[PDB]
């Protein structure tokens, strides 16, 4: 209702109720042409004053002031109703998700370099939310709010219990969150995944990074780690979805080994746009690797939404996440993040 309100006050007309498709994601979104024949993407974050909307705007204010020479791009904010939580953007034409690109074999080394340049640029400061991001949610490692249990599958609850009962993992996560108080922080997405990227022109155009609801001043290791962890997850689960546990690990290990160039590509793109990232931050690769480890638990728990049982591929993947989180220094070297 307020969508057309806003779309009209913006010179855009109203959206054809048909031809207006809807993408995925928790928030409501509408895409397609308006009656003035202009293509829009509309997102709605319903309020009670949403911090997510403010953070999404904190970004579109920066992105509006970026030269065309920038590896970092946003599609373009046409307007916004802060009061009712509506945001209008230029629709990217024939946009394919980075998650579809990944599964189809088309998220190659060149596109991983693009992504790294974009993320390197982002990381090179008022207006920004400075609150700690709740990822990982540390109090959930002690105890899940009962409300949250009633929105989780049996497999999600079982994953959380595995985490909760693993004292070494819980403690590694605490140390990782404490370093965030004592390191060079930087503008950061804080919710990065293949499906937070889109490529224009059916995967032949420019690369966009979207969903800035978590945009903060935070540990840049969050974004590097998240992207490494997307590949770790893909290599040891998404590609493999009654074998033995040893057979599942060996298969997954080989798959990982073969997907490592993707992470090295990203890291080279990152260092191209931010060569002095380690100047005062020598722990960045190690921390990135820890976040990659956690990212695997994060994706496992999310994919387990639609499961009653935690299958043995899930469990083997989880085992690799624990090796990376508890051994971040070695994982940085093997993932290619120690490169100079």
């Amino acid at each position: 209702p307020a969508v057309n309100a806003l779309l009209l006050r913006l010179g855009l007309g109203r959206l054809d109720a048909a031809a207006t498709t809807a993408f995925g994601g928790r928030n409501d979104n509408w895409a397609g042409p308006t009656t003035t024949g202009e293509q829009v993407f509309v997102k709605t974050v319903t309020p009670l004053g949403c911090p997510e909307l403010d953070r999404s705007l904190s970004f579109e204010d920066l992105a509006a002031r970026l030269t065309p020479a920038s590896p970092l791009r946003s599609p373009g904010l046409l307007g916004a109703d802060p009061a009712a939580g509506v945001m209008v953007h230029r629709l990217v034409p024939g946009a394919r998700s980075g998650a579809e690109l990944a599964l189809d074999g088309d998220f190659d080394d060149d596109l991983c370099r693009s992504a790294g340049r974009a993320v390197g640029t982002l990381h090179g400061v008022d207006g920004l939310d400075t609150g700690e991001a709740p990822l990982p949610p540390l109090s959930w490692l002690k105890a899940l709010p009962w409300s949250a249990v009633q929105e989780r599958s049996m497999a999600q609850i079982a994953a959380w219990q595995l985490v909760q009962d693993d004292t070494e993992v819980v403690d590694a996560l605490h140390r990782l969150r404490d370093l965030e108080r004592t390191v060079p922080l930087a503008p950061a997405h804080c919710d990065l995944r293949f499906d937070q990227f889109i490529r224009a022109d059916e995967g032949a155009g420019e690369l966009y990074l979207v969903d800035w609801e978590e945009f903060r001043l935070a540990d840049p290791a969050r974004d590097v780690g998240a992207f490494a962890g997307e590949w770790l997850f893909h290599a040891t689960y998404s590609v493999f979805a009654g074998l033995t546990h040893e057979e599942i690990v060996a298969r997954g290990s080989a798959s990982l080994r073969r997907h490592l160039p993707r992470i090295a590509a990203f890291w080279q793109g990152y260092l191209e746009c931010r060569p002095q990232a380690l100047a005062l931050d020598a722990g960045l690769p190690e921390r990135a690797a820890a976040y990659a480890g956690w990212h695997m638990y994060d994706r496992l728990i999310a994919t387990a939404e639609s499961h009653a049982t935690l299958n043995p591929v899930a469990r083997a993947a989880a085992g690799i996440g624990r090796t990376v989180l508890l051994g971040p220094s070695a994982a940085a070297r093997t993932l290619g993040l120690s490169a100079e």
Binding site: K142, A143, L144, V149, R152, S153, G242
Partner: protein, 308 residues
């Protein structure tokens, strides 16, 4: 020229269905209702056969909020007494909270859901909380509910009851009916029902898990649904299960004396043992291997809905 004659020691329904099933010598090819299934080893056919058997013999062939409301509104009780060791108490001006190690997870429960003792005890001390009986997300595809009465200490044996259901509308009424019946008989149960409208019809659109003594609850659910069988349910049922009415079947959770090879769902368990025995024949009659296979999985070959 008779199925029981050529397949002895086997429940008739089963011996009949083994006529639609062939496994070639070598164990790399098999036919299941004139659908062929192909593999590159025995071991790989074991898996593809189990799936083909499971689909033809046991099964055949979103979370709409409206339905969920309709399904949620059909529940008698609202709460179930759940035990667990207390960890910690959290004083808050917003409202106090108990950190409790439940058996499935450690959780943060408002302290106003305590029931025994009524005064939060020391950490480690067992406590009994009052938690929602409706869990709509716990079983993907399914709205799910637990009995108002605490299940037995070890849970022990479990009686499943499958109710075919043509559609949402069918399910709503069968749901309300079955739960109505089950609380009146005071059954020690859990239960669930498809919450996705475009996923019906299904032999297991409703499942009910019954502990300790199932007769009262079974007798009770039978009578409540007699009226509807055929029209609101569908006729046909799993070949592994004991029919009680059109669309209404039942059976026991799998008890299995072999380690590693155990802890499956009832359908997949049987289909697995069945596919195993068929496979073991082809590596050279047939019904003797099938029957032996069933007995190693702790299945009664005469009464496959039951265990040894």
């Amino acid at each position: 020229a008779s199925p029981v004659a050529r397949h002895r020691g086997l429940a008739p329904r089963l011996a009949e269905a083994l006529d639609a099933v062939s496994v070639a010598p070598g164990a790399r090819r098999a036919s299941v209702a004139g659908r062929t299934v192909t593999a590159d080893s025995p071991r790989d056919l074991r898996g593809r056969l189990t799936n083909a058997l499971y689909e033809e013999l046991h099964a055949g062939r979103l979370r709409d909020p409206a339905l969920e409301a309709r399904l949620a509104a059909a529940v008698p009780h609202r709460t179930t007494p759940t035990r667990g060791r207390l960890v910690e108490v959290l004083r808050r001006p917003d409202g106090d909270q108990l950190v409790v190690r439940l058996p499935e997870v450690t959780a943060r429960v408002p302290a106003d859901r305590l029931l025994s003792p009524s005064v939060p005890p020391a950490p480690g001390e067992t406590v009994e909380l009052a938690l929602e009986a409706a869990r709509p997300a716990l079983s993907p595809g399914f709205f799910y509910v637990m009995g108002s009465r605490p299940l037995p200490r070890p849970a022990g044996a479990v009686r499943r009851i499958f109710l075919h259901a043509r559609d949402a509308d069918a399910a709503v009424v069968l749901w309300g009916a079955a739960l109505g019946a089950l609380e009146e008989a005071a059954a020690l149960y859990h239960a669930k029902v498809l919450s996705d409208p475009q996923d019906f019809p299904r032999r297991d659109a409703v499942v009910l898990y019954l502990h300790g003594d199932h007769r009262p609850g079974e007798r009770a659910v039978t009578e409540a649904v007699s009226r509807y069988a055929g029209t609101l349910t569908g006729p046909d049922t799993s070949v592994f299960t004991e029919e009680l009415a059109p669309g209404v079947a039942a059976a026991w959770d799998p008890q299995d004396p072999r380690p590693g090879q155990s802890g499956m769902s009832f359908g997949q368990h049987r289909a697995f043992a069945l596919a195993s025995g068929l496979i073991d024949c082809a590596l050279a009659g047939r019904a003797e291997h099938v029957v032996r296979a069933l007995r190693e999985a702790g299945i009664d070959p005469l009464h496959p809905q039951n265990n040894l």
